[PDB]
Design an enzyme around this catalytic site. Structure first.
Site, PDB file in Angstrom:
ATOM      1  N   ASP A  91     -24.798 -47.187  30.883  1.00 49.59           N
ATOM      2  CA  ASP A  91     -26.134 -47.169  30.312  1.00 49.59           C
ATOM      3  C   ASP A  91     -26.404 -48.453  29.511  1.00 49.59           C
ATOM      4  OD1 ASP A  91     -26.646 -44.324  31.308  1.00 49.59           O
ATOM      5  OD2 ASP A  91     -25.355 -43.745  29.595  1.00 49.59           O
ATOM      6  N   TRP A 102     -16.312 -35.266  32.792  1.00 57.84           N
ATOM      7  CA  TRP A 102     -16.956 -34.057  33.282  1.00 57.84           C
ATOM      8  C   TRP A 102     -18.060 -33.611  32.327  1.00 57.84           C
ATOM      9  CZ3 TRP A 102     -18.408 -32.398  37.421  1.00 57.84           C
ATOM     10  CH2 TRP A 102     -18.842 -31.081  37.587  1.00 57.84           C
ATOM     11  N   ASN A 103     -19.299 -33.668  32.815  1.00 58.76           N
ATOM     12  CA  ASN A 103     -20.479 -33.423  31.993  1.00 58.76           C
ATOM     13  C   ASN A 103     -20.794 -31.922  31.909  1.00 58.76           C
ATOM     14  OD1 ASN A 103     -21.400 -35.805  30.733  1.00 58.76           O
ATOM     15  ND2 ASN A 103     -22.021 -36.619  32.722  1.00 58.76           N
TER      16      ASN A 103
END
Length: 565
Positions: free
Chosen positions: A250, A348-349
């Site tokens: 990002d 892992w979201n």
């Protein structure tokens, strides 16, 4: 049944039990912490000086009385953090492959003790982890965890054999906006306590740096920015940080070569020369599988980033998507590990709910390939900003990370709920059942959903739906009852407070569901008068539901009640 969580690789229970005298005598030399653990537990027995027996040792000790005694059971536990744990009727052996292994051996022992007499079953456990890194990252947007929450989280990680905490708080400017700047004087005691608590718990404190917003690569400024980076890392080293990560997720810059080069230089000129510093960790700009590929071809950024980057640098990715709706298959991971020429680390979201903050994720880690470990060396859980409410999912994550081969989501979920909710585990699961699915996760209340889908087919055909109505009515009655019982008896009050609006809404869903059945029954009875009244009460209940911000039971129960009206 003996219950060790996470589930050990290999465990055999023996025929007999035994009890403990008030004096013990421990023979072992051994890890400060593993040992201090053993003590604090015994004293929660005393240490005798002569001849029941408990031998606690690492392999690097090659302790005689231990290795001799442990002739009965054979050792093919090779991996780091591996351990063997034996109890027999009276000796008890705690043999790690290393300092961490011995600590985890004691953590497993602490779960074996039944306390009144103080018994200790006989078992042989041969145990080691599927993934070499089993972490939680503070990677949600929203209000950060407080110091108490962080410390509380770290202790839980050591309890359940998670070995890393990635300190990456979006709102802490010294990880990002002010990455060049060392931690002020005011902040030092805060950070040391974190690091010290992590150290005592065999949890790697990983400090994450996100320089991407303004870092320079080119020319004089580049050299300055690089020196800044080295300096900052030196500070953190001084505080006791032994694990580092540089993140490019990002940001704006799309230069794979320059980012990888910054990483290789840092790895070369800092990581490898500093004692006790662990491998560098990174995350690319193209951090989800689909972002990395244009059709069958690898995209430019990934091509340049992956080709340039040193193979001993760890790389995190999220799976095919930012939030993969259907977990991560071996083939998904293979495609990415083939491009990067290394075992990947999975960020892992889930349970993170920052993108849907009114719904709590209270389900197990779900749909992750049982054999992901073939292509993936790290498992990293991104939790919710709500610390206590994150624990159930996180613990299933600990179980999966430790023992991916034998991990079963539903059975694992049961154990995590028991750990977190205690005597209220049955009431809690009834609630949590309706709150598992976000953009990923176990589907909410699947049996209820099948019941409904089946009901509607029969309804359209004018067939009798008594069994389904009966089934639904039982569910809705439990929904009515569990909120009060949880509000009354749930011991974890931070958890209760985080969930309180959800629980209140859940009670109303129960009532709305009971009313919807009545409305259906009125239609079957052709009772126009009763139908009008119930319909009216149902509309009022719907209004009460729509007035509450919290999201729960929104995929299965909610549409059912709305379809009835």
């Amino acid at each position: 049944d003996i219950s060790i969580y996470p589930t050990p690789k290999d465990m055999t229970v023996g025929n007999s039990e035994f009890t403990l005298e008030d004096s013990v005598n421990i023979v072992g030399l051994a890890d400060t912490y593993a040992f201090e653990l053993l003590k604090n537990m015994l004293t929660e027995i005393k240490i005798n000086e002569s001849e029941y027996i408990g031998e606690s040792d690492d392999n690097i000790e090659e302790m005689e009385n231990t290795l001799e005694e442990m002739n009965v059971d054979t050792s093919s536990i090779s991996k780091d953090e591996g351990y063997v744990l034996v109890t027999d009727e009276n000796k008890i052996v705690i043999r790690g492959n290393d300092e961490t292994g011995t600590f985890y051996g004691v953590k497993s022992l602490k779960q074996l003790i039944k306390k009144n007499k103080v018994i200790l079953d006989e078992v042989v456990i041969k145990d080691e982890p599927s993934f070499k890194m089993r972490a939680v990252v503070e990677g949600f947007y929203g209000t950060p965890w407080s110091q108490e929450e962080r410390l509380d989280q770290i202790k839980m990680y050591g309890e359940y054999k998670m070995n890393a905490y990635i300190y990456a708080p979006k709102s802490d400017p010294y990880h990002r906006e002010k990455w060049r700047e060392p931690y002020p004087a005011s902040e030092l005691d805060r950070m040391k306590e974190l690091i010290k608590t992590a150290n005592e718990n065999k949890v790697d404190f990983v400090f994450a740096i996100s320089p991407g917003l303004d870092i320079k690569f080119e020319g004089e400024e580049g050299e300055a920015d690089f020196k800044a980076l080295i300096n900052k890392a030196e500070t953190l080293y001084d505080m006791g940080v032994r694990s580092f990560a540089i993140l490019w997720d990002d940001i704006e810059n799309r230069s794979g070569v320059q980012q990888a080069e910054v990483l290789n230089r840092f790895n070369k000129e800092f990581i490898k020369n500093k004692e006790g510093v662990k491998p560098l960790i990174t995350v690319p700009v193209e951090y989800w599988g689909s972002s990395m590929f244009n059709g069958e071809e690898v995209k430019t950024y990934t091509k340049e980033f992956a080709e340039t980057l040193d193979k001993d640098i760890e790389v995190m990715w999220t799976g095919n998507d930012v939030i993969p709706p259907n977990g991560v298959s071996l083939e998904d991971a293979k495609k990415v590990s083939n491009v990067y020429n290394r075992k990947m680390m999975l960020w892992w979201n889930y349970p993170v709910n920052d993108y849907k903050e009114d719904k709590m994720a209270l389900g197990p880690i779900y749909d992750l390939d049982r054999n992901l470990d073939e292509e993936v060396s790290g498992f990293i859980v991104n939790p919710m900003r709500f610390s206590d409410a994150s624990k159930i999912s996180t613990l299933t994550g600990a179980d999966y990370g430790w023992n991916s081969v034998s991990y079963e989501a539903e059975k694992s979920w049961d154990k995590a709920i028991e750990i977190i909710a205690g005597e209220m585990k049955e009431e809690f699961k009834i609630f949590a059942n309706h709150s598992t699915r976000l953009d990923t996760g176990r589907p909410d209340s699947p049996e209820i959903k099948n019941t409904i889908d089946s009901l509607w087919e029969k309804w359209e055909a004018g067939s009798d739906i008594s069994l389904e109505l009966s089934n639904l009515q039982n569910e809705f009655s439990k929904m009515v009852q569990v909120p009060n019982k949880l509000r009354s008896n749930l011991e974890n009050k931070a958890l209760l407070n985080q969930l309180d609006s959800h629980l209140s809404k859940f009670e109303i869903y129960g009532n709305a569901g009971l009313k919807s059945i009545e409305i259906l029954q009125d239609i079957v009875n052709k009772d126009m008068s009763e139908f009008w009244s119930d319909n009216f009460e149902g509309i009022k209940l719907l209004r009460n539901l729509d007035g509450i911000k919290a999201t729960i039971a929104n995929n299965v129960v909610d549409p059912f009640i709305r379809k009835v009206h």
